[PDB]
Every structure is written in structure tokens, then in C-alpha cells.
Amino acid sequence: SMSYTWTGALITPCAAEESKLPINPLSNSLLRHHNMVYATTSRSASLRQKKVTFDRLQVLDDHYRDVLKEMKAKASTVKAKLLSIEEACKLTPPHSAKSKFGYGAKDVRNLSSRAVNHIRSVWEDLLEDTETPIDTTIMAKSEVFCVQPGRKPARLIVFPDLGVRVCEKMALYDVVSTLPQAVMGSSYGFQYSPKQRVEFLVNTWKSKKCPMGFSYDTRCFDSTVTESDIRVEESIYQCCDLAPEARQAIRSLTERLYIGGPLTNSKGQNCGYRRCRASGVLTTSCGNTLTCYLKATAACRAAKLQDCTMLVNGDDLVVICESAGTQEDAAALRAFTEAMTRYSAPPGDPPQPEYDLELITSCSSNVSVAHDASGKRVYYLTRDPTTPLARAAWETARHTPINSWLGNIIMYAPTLWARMILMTHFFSILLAQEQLEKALDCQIYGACYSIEPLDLPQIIERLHGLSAFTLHSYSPGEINRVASCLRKLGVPPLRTWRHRARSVRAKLLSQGGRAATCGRYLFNWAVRTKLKLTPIPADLSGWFVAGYSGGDIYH
């Protein structure tokens, strides 16, 4: 079937839409080629629509069915509870989009009588009505990038009203937080902290006689997902032990929301109909992860690849296996791609087999190595820092709701760029406005978190260990990528950052505790006299459990 159908009516914005990085003394200190940085807008919506709208070919076989049953067997071990209204309400972000029926996120979070009663209605409606399609809104995402030597069109997000999103959580939060791990086991990506992810990739790599590995980029995954795929995904959820009201909710949400529905623009006009994954519902991450894992797992058998270990994060996929010789590896990977095409998951760019772990890009990241205080090799996780930096400039010049910089500091703390540029730049600013204490919103695996910068030393210690404060002797491939990037974007070269860092470090020391602890630990790479570095005195229990991208989750 057609992934989408369009009435012709436009995909509209609901506010002013900003697209150019402004000239600001704060952002210009970080990066100077301001005309290279842009945000996507709805002005580019039609270009995306063209890309996402197509006919899907899908043909299932024995291998598909075989893996599906294996997955269903493990799903049967799961007991899942209903959240109460209170729990589901406490999971709603404070800046989540308001309802059409006269209540917002603040009301939901307070359990105001109005929100609560509409939530009860929507739920009872899900128990009573098993067919009527449920309305969605469609909007062009605002995202920041650097120009390519050639712009990206905005992404399209699609989501139901707030009353439904609370009901999704009641019915499905426990499932989408526990079912993926029981089914995929060590292949479920979102269980791993960055240090744990690198551990798993290195251990898996070093466990093979002759490793070969590849990433596989599916072309616009959400549009490849068929109605069949979403019913199959429901067949997995239904293997859980569920309360009756849960089971019916899941059934109605599947037929009325997840498989498709009408699309409405911001002006209340009808844009079209959807027959694929919606980016903006609770089950997208779980569902995409399961679906990716299922097709890829079956395609591996079809391709005859040997001793496969896969690692899956929604629609991001990486596979490590036993080489069969370079040319036999190439023909097997091509068989794999073709199997996936049949399962309705064709490639964006053809995958290439790799024989050096550092050359594989999964979740926009790659493994690299450095050395700690005592000279031991420490494997860490990094990426091309262009987008982080472009966004960091943008978030310095403009107030955004989510601060990608802070999320990038946490995730990439041990990296060369995050340490010398991000920490330096942002801590210098927070000092100068006396806002070190103030908590800021960031995203980790799609969930929203309110973190305060003064907690970054211990957060980084837990997530990465003391070494993220003492790494040195980075590889030249990595130093070269960073240095080039900076020249391209007009970011000052690293020696400038070193000097700015020393000035910032000295200022944090002459402050107090905590602040000085930032100075001591975060900026020990800058100072002349190297320092002690003992563990730091000071709940991270729910941080790397599951993915929630598009799922409207706050913790």
C-alpha cells in the first residue's frame, strides 16, 4: 500500500519559524561562519513528503516466521501492569503539547479535575470503540544542521492529542519499557550506557576469529513499516500477561492509531492519510526496534552470514559476524540487503563490510581509543562533531526547549571536542550569568531530563568512570576530524580553547565546593600541574533501560 495519501492541503506551522543563526557575541565566540548553520522549516515540507510517500513491496517467508515465533516465545515470559492515571500523568513532560479539549501539560501533571475526566473519557472510548480512526496532527520538525557542499528537508512528526498519549502510557508504558529486553536480550541497545555499549562492541568484536561488521541504513524506516508489520508487532505485545482493559486498549490503539489514520495540519484542515509508522506515539521506539530486529535477524539467516551478533536501537542497526573471506563477505552482505528489501526495508545507501571496528558508524557514533592517567588503553565512543557544534551555537544564540549541548556533554564526556570546546564554552557562559545552579532540560534516549550542570562531574563518573577526566593521546584520525571540522565552521582552533579553559578553571576554583569540583575534574586536562583525582562522594537507575523517542516521556 501507499505510505501516505495527500489531499493537497499544506503542512502548516503553528508559530513563527526561525531559520538563520543570528549574529550574537556569545555564539560568535564559539563559531564564526554563522551562515553555514540553519534550522529546517515547514517551507521544505513538500520535499520530504515526496521522499516519504511510496508504494511498499513486502513478501514474508519461512525465516521471517521462524524468528517471529522465537521472539513470541520470549515475549510470553512478560507480565505487564497498567499504570494508574497518576503515574501516567507524572510521566508527561511539562512542555508537552496541550489538548484540543481545553487543558494542557501543567493540568495533566496536577491531576486537575478537567484533564482527569477527559482522560477517563478517552480511555473508556478505547474500551468501547474498536474501529474509528483517531485523529493525528502533522507538523514539520525544527532541526539544526551545517550546510553540505545542500540542505536537508524538515522531518515530519505525527501525533495524537494529549488525552490519547496519557492513555498510551496507562496501557503500554510497562510493556515498551520491558518487552524489548526480554525478546532481544543483549541486542537491545537502549539498555547500555555509552561505556557499556563500547564494552559490548569491543567484546563482541574481539570474540570473533575473523570479525567483519556493517551498519545498515534503511531508507526512511517509518515509511517502510507496513500495516502487516504493526499487527505483527501487536501479536508480540499480546503474548504478555495483560489486564483485560489493557488488552482491549492495545487492540483498539493498534487498529485506530498505530496502523494509520487521518492527518490534520495546524489549521484544522485535512492533509491526508497515513499507513505507516507515526513518529510521535509511545510504541515507535519499541516497535521500530522489534521490527528492525526481526527483519534483520531473518535476513542474516537468508544471507547465510555466520555467528551474527546484532545491536539494535529503533531503526539503527549494526551487525558483527565471522568473516568468510572478503569476496564471500561482499556477496553475503548483498544477499542480506536484498532479503531486507523483500521484507520492505530497503537500503538508503548500500552497506559496506568493514574489518576495523573504528570504521563502523552505529547511532551516528564510532569507537575510538585513547589512554588514561596510567597509560592504559581506554575505548570510548565519539562522532563527527559538526552537528553538535552547529546546534551548540544555535542554542547559545536562541533559547530552545531542549539543550542538545548538555545531552551531548553527558553522552560524549570523554571525547576531545566535548571536553575542550563544549564544557569550556558553556561553563564560561554559566559563570558569567551566575546560572550554574539552574537546572536545564535535555534528552537521553528520547526521554526528557531536568539536569543541573553542577552535577556533571558525578554523572560523568558513573556513566564513564574517572578516565573521562584524564584521557589523553587520542588517535590522529580523531584529532584530524575535529581540527578539520573547526576550520570548516570557523570555530577557534583547540589551543584557543585550552587558554579559555585555564581562565574558566581558575574561576571555578575560587567559587566554592561543587563549582570547584567542576573545575578540578572537568578541566584537569588544561592545567599545568596534573592532579590527584579520587572518586567523588555522591539515582541513575532508570537512565539506560529503554528508548522513548517520540514517546512524550519525562523523568
Residue numbers in the entry: 1 to 149, 153 to 541, 546 to 562
Wording from the paper:
The RNA-dependent RNA polymerase (RdRp), or non-structural 5B (NS5B) protein, catalyzes HCV RNA replication, i.e. the synthesis of single-stranded positive-strand RNA genomes. As such, it is an obvious target for antiviral intervention. The 3D structure of HCV RdRp revealed a ‘right hand’ shape, including ‘fingers’, ‘palm’ and ‘thumb’ subdomains (6–8). NNIs bind to one of the RdRp allosteric sites and this binding alters the 3D conformation of the enzyme, thereby impairing polymerase activity at the initiation step.
The structure displayed the typical right-hand shape of an RNA polymerase, with the palm, thumb and fingers subdomains organized around a central cleft defining the active site. Quercetagetin was found to bind to the fingers and C-terminal domains of HCV RdRp, at the entrance of the RNA template tunnel. The structure showed that quercetagetin binds closely to residues D559, G557, G283, R168, F162, I160, A97 and S96, with its B ring within a 2.9–4.0 Å distance of these amino acids, making a π-stacking interaction with the side chain of F162 and one hydrogen bond with G283. That was the case of the strictly conserved G283 residue which interacts with the 2′-hydroxyl of the template RNA ±1 ribose and makes a hydrogen bond with the B ring of quercetagetin, and of the highly conserved F162 residue which stacks both the sugar of the RNA template pairing nucleotide and the B ring of quercetagetin at its top. Superimposition of our crystallographic structure with the recently published crystallographic structure of HCV NS5B in complex with primer-template RNA suggested that quercetagetin interferes with the ability of the enzyme to interact with RNA. Altogether, these results indicate that quercetagetin inhibits RNA binding to the HCV RdRp through a direct interaction with the enzyme. No change was observed for S96A and G557A, whereas susceptibility of the D559 variant was reduced 7-fold in the enzyme assay. Due to the conservation of the residues at the quercetagetin binding site across HCV genotypes, this new NNI binding site has the potential for pangenotypic activity.
